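Box 3.1. Reading complex inputs
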Amino acid sequence: AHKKAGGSTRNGRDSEAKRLGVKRFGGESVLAGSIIVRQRGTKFHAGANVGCGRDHTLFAKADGKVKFEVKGPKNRKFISIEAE
Amino acid sequence: MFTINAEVRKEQGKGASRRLRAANKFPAIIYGGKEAPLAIELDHDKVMNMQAKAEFYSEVLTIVVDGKEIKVKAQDVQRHPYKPKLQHIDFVRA
Amino acid sequence: TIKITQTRSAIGRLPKHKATLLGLGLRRIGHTVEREDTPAIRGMINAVSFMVKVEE
Amino acid sequence: KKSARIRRATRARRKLQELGATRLVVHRTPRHIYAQVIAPNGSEVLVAASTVEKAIAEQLKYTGNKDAAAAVGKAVAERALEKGIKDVSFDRSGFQYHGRVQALADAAREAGL
Amino acid sequence: QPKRTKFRKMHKGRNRGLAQGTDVSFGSFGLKAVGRGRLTARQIEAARRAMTRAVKRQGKIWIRVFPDKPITEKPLAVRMGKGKGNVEYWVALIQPGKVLYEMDGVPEELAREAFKLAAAKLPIKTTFVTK
RNA sequence: GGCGGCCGUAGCGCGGUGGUCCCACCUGACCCCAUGCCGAACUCAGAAGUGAAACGCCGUAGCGCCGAUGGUAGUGUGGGGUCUCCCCAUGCGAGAGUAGGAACUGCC
RNA sequence: AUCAGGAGGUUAGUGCAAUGGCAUAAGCCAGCUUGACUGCGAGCGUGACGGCGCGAGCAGGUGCGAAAGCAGGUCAUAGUG
RNA sequence: UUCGGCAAGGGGGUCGACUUCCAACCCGAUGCAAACUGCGAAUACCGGAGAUGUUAUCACGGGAGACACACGGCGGGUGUAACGUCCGUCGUGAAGAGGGAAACAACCCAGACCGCAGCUAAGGUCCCAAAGUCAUGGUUAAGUGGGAAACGAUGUGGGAAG
């Protein structure tokens, strides 16, 4: 029923995440990168996470959220190639 | 008023410090409000015996660095581990 | 540019650093080469700074 | 990310900011009704008109009714079209339906917005 | 030996206990030991009881380090049995320059004779410090 | 109080002082309109009474958070000795301690 | 037991193991309602390999909404040949 | 997870007060964590510019072997520990010969066509054994020439401090 044995986190296997979409090349508005699911907001390049900063770039495409609270889950403001 | 001789810390490092400590000398820093903080090299033997005399921290020590006094008061003293000696001491202009 | 001259021998030197010098065009002691001052060139000379004597 | 204080009060709208346009705020006081055409990045007011200013024209009755709310909408919008704005979204933070805010919006469209 | 602590089984009790001395005035004297070492509560008691049984002249004798690290043993076959709590009870961790026993006393040292008796009970060459 | 500019060191606690211009509290619910049980919500109307919640100013830095002057442990990377272990070269540098900041700026 | 006041970011609760998320809420109460739609593609699982799954479109059209929009079942990772 | 003070509860002893003990809370001083953390490296790593390398990078097809490794170093997890099990990085044993280490798979230097001359590496220079029984200075007497430990030591020498 409950949970016992004063223990912390619960484990299993190896993570199933990747680094798809380095971004500096074309990219249709879709989930750039993969780690955890369910998240929206970013509609372009919005790599911004606590640290030395983050980035992405060039690619004119309406929308394009991130994975979730990970590699810059925050939603910055627009960005395209330079001249789409 | 304890009169002590000293110099200036040019090669600020642990290696250079160990070469001085071996010759009986340790680093120190002096600060005083509007006065610019200064790092100097004090005599080990002299200070060690003077710092033993309680009044050391309450006096207006007359530190003569190279060729001129500064006048300061002792704040705190960092001691050495494995070999009981002076490692670094803080000073405040008075 | 900078003139690089191999002062140290190949014996004892760490690999890769050896490949670096073999890169600059030096494969024997005494040999000298002229490398223009550019980002990479500076990095390599830095890795072989111990084995050679550079100056512009 | 966490929900900002403004998001907790849901008075703001991030979905209208993803487009990059302007808003049409409708403030209402038990005495007067205000309307503005503010643009993103702070409180940039391009054009605005108060029901009290409607008196400058020739308003006689009270300024806290529905017919007055529609009069202000036509004024704020008329000045907006004179500014250079065409489209705008309705932003009525906290209010019911068919109220004075709807009369303000219906008035804005009547002008050309 | 990774520092173990809680979330474990209940073992034995402290052979130690008597903090001794009056806790009305806090001082800064001491008896430092040059070198890191693990001392079990069973040893701490012998050393502590040695000096306390000598400093009958006065008091103000206090200890700063307490045994908190658990250490088990597996007396049996092997495959089965990680480690139970036997003779090897709580063990304290002493640093190369840590003060274990400090007695609030001004130059009237009648405890140096006491600390000497204890210094011969704990494994590690300790030295008497006035500061 | 109105009207702008810059536009996250403005988290969270605490002190003094002023305005009957402005503004909420407040007061009243005839009616539009509205509450599953309650004009409290919701919506309308008037201004008897304050500034007590706001606001304008201004004084403490507690605690959070963001920068700066002083320094040792800690830690890469490559050769030395030594029973283990420790040392040297070279790129940097814990926490404790001394100070900084409690908005800014134009117009009526 | 319940009712009134105060303190209280939240340690509650959120179906299920654990971590992570959340309070003028993704939690509670109430009302209403019910997208678990059809068709077809692009992408994701170092290094090729199916079923299955998921994120993101388009075409038409169901439900709810003022609308953007939200569903391809239950916040995500076990409940299958 | 240490100590002091205050308030509330329970038990025992003498009096409805006091004393003692235990548990929870708050404040000022005392201590910790492989599944904690306000902080935070080095470092490993994606992409892009400045060396080195060139038909490489890459595509397709044919034939494979192979899935009982081991050791040193560094970082480990388990274990009392092991010429212990079990991982990770790297260099080697396996194809490292040659040289030193007395002899010696993985310790140090170093990596080979033949023949020839020269100079060095490691190491070594009293003799066996090629090369100084070399120079300045100091210490030890024990032949110590170093298992040899925890521990002990006015055997003896050097340096600093009251």
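In summary: Chain A is about 0% helix and 0% strand.
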